[PDB]
Amino acid sequence: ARKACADATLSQITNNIDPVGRIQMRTRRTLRGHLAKIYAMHWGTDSRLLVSASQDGKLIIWDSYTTNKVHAIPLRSSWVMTCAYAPSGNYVACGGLDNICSIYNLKTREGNVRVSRELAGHTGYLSCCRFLDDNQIVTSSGDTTCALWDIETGQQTTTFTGHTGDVMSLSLAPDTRLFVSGACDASAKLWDVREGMCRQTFTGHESDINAICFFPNGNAFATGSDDATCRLFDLRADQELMTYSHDNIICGITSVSFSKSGRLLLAGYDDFNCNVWDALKADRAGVLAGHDNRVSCLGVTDDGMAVATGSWDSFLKIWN
Amino acid sequence: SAEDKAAVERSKMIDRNLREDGEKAAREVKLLLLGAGESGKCTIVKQMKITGIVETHFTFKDLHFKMFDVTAQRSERKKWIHCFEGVTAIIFCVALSDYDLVNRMHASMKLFDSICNNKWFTDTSIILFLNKKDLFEEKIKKSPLTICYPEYAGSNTYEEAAAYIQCQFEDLNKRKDTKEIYTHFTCSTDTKNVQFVFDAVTDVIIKNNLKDCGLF
Amino acid sequence: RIKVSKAAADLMAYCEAHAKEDPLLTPVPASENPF
Amino acid sequence: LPPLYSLVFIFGFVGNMLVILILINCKRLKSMTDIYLLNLAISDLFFLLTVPFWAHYAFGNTMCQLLTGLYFIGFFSGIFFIILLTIDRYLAVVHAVFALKARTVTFGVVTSVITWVVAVFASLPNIIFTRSQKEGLHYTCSSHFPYSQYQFWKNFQTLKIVILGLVLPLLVMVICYSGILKTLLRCRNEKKRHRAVRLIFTIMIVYFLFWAPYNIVLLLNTFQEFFGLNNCSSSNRLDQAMQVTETLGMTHCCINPIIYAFVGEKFRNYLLVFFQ
């Protein structure tokens, strides 16, 4: 249909760009306070506090600068697979298999964290949650449906439908007017937070998509699937751009994150370590390892000061 | 250094109470319930003792038990079965009467073979329960078992028909030396069914401790 | 539906503008680095 | 015989350290039985560091009193730890539900310090009666007791070194493993039990092939009334009998990791991860 717009490949345009090079990134500090496997992790807007969810029933907020635990929210359900951190920093979200997006208020009397609101209405297991703002939150569930939520009422403000498979992850654009989600049918949908429509459909993968992240300008995004390929898509041309595939790697991708500049791409693989990709050259520029188990989380701060990776070995590391 | 000392001090309190908070998980036994249809999580939960997943807490012989039922989860199991990796044991509930209805027993092993040979369930044993035994005899007297499997269970006698089905569930795994499979015929008594669970999990605790004790 | 070249040109221009103020691809001094 | 001392430190020294270097980074002491083997690793080196200094390798009375102690506290700590591991193994299998609440680190460290302080308490009578006969040798230090109480201290030191040496551990070795085997034959896995039951018999016999020869020659050396004093000819032959048993007792300290740690199925999994 839109193959007429495919005039040239980005690699041919980016062939003249100087490569990033084999950058070496080391672990400045390791966060080892959890007990069970880590499945969720989010970065704060202040680039100071990060929250991680483990299977022990504990929601721990970590102080990245001082390596300390600011909070430890006792989860009602020990099974959690997603978490979020509010842009204001007052609330923290957590999902799981209980179909409940528990939100806790950090700013309370005597420093006692309490459940701000109980969210229900998803028949499938929750897979991803993202805070649009202090008043709204987008949640991805295993019932092939994602919906927008309101805090003080808890009702279904806007429900996004059109996914054939269950959604695994989603990310929010910097302007927060649009967001995309990746399901298990090797497809990605663009949803408007105000209208809840399906402007265009992104696809091209050969397996289930498990990672979603926008480009820092908001005009593009990348997907991470289990077909051992990372695919970057743009909201304007709506095509496949610069697939990140290597013959050495055959394992899937579980987390994809973008640096603040967007020049290099962070991709989390289940081969017991994480990988760093060049977002314009599709070259494996720098490889970081050290996780005892497979990595499950990957996020970059707003200012790009540091990047954190969450693995199943109950260890959190910060890379610079 | 007043502000930084208080942050570390309150973080030390966070690390202190998680030492026993996570220790209670070690004492507690995590049990996972599987089932082809509505037959899962109906037998043991019927005992009178104490949204997506319903968990039952009950202490037997001074041992805490936590049973997790995933019947309400209608999503693809390949996305969330790895979340349950590391449980103490897996409890499988299948109705012996579910062979003359549309074929359900063929789907039961299809669910059973996926969970038993799963890559994340290598060290976790499975305690399968052959339910509906009270009316299984009447059902096989009404209609032969040959309609389910072309290889008949002997000569259509209850003594060997139930013994044939249990073996057909215990030979699907190739990892027989890696983990053991416990089979029990549920009866019309809550104290008899929970007793087998306690003994089966006890053996799992014995097996699991041996790797830490170095015997294995 | 703009051409891929026009969309690719926007991506490289955004990366080039923010390349100097990028702590990952350009390392920062240890004292300035909070970690 | 000089090469025999080097063979002990060839793999026993760094092998003991490799156990410590793999439990900190990888194991992180998540299991409670992990701390019973790290202090066991400290104890055997405390016995190992005495071997080079026992051969008069090169400070008259102070240093060897620490060297004599480092032998005994190093010896009593390791021999008391393996008793705790068998008690740990006993409670783990014969009382499955009772151990789950008993197997905790907060109880593991408090019972490891008390067995550390009973070793120095049972050893301090040796440090009190430790002086150097020859200062020129600088490594020949023996136990000297008053003539009035020479028979009391010589008998008491011997009475406690043997009962705490063999019969108290071996009595724990048999009453615990008998209950272990009684709670192991029903594991419905004949292939895996064959190697499990075979290895647990090795743990008992090697204890009777490395420490028993030290004790067999010890009672005869202490109780001269039976054979030693009457013969008076084997005393020259028995002069080196203690030295060859000490090495035979020292080599038991460097085989602890291969019999308590390197025999666990999951333990080699961390070895290749540590090698990277």
Numbering used by the authors:
A (entry chain B): 21 to 340
B (entry chain A): 6 to 55, 182 to 233, 241 to 354
C (entry chain C): 27 to 61
D (entry chain R): 33 to 90, 96 to 313
Copy out sentences from the published article reporting this entry, exactly as the authors wrote them.
The chemokine receptor CCR5 plays a vital role in immune surveillance and inflammation. CCR5 exerts its physiological functions by binding to multiple chemokines, such as macrophage inflammatory protein (MIP-1α, also known as CCL3) and RANTES (regulated on activation normal T cell expressed and secreted, also known as CCL5).
The data showed a wild-type level of basal and chemokine-induced activities for the engineered receptor. Close inspection of the structure revealed conformational rearrangements of the aromatic residues at the bottom of the ligand-binding cavity. Compared to the structures of the chemokine–CCR5–Gi1 complexes and inactive CCR5, side chain of the conserved CKR residue W862.60 rotates toward helix VII by approximate 90° in the apo structure, occupying a similar position to the binding site of the residue 3 in the chemokines. To form a hydrogen bond with the side chain of Y1083.32, the residue Y2516.51 undergoes a downward shift (relative to that in the inactive CCR5 structure), placing its side chain in a conformation similar to that in the chemokine–CCR5–Gi1 complexes. This rearrangement results in the conformational change of W2486.48 and subsequent rearrangement on the receptor intracellular side, leading to receptor activation. Nevertheless, this does not rule out the possibility that the specific conformations of these key residues on the extracellular side are stabilized by and/or resulted from the G protein coupling. The mutant W862.60F displayed a basal activity that is 70% of the wild-type response, while the alanine replacement further reduced the activity to 50%, supporting the critical role of this residue in inducing receptor constitutive activation by altering the interactions within the aromatic residue cluster through the conformational change of its bulky side chain.
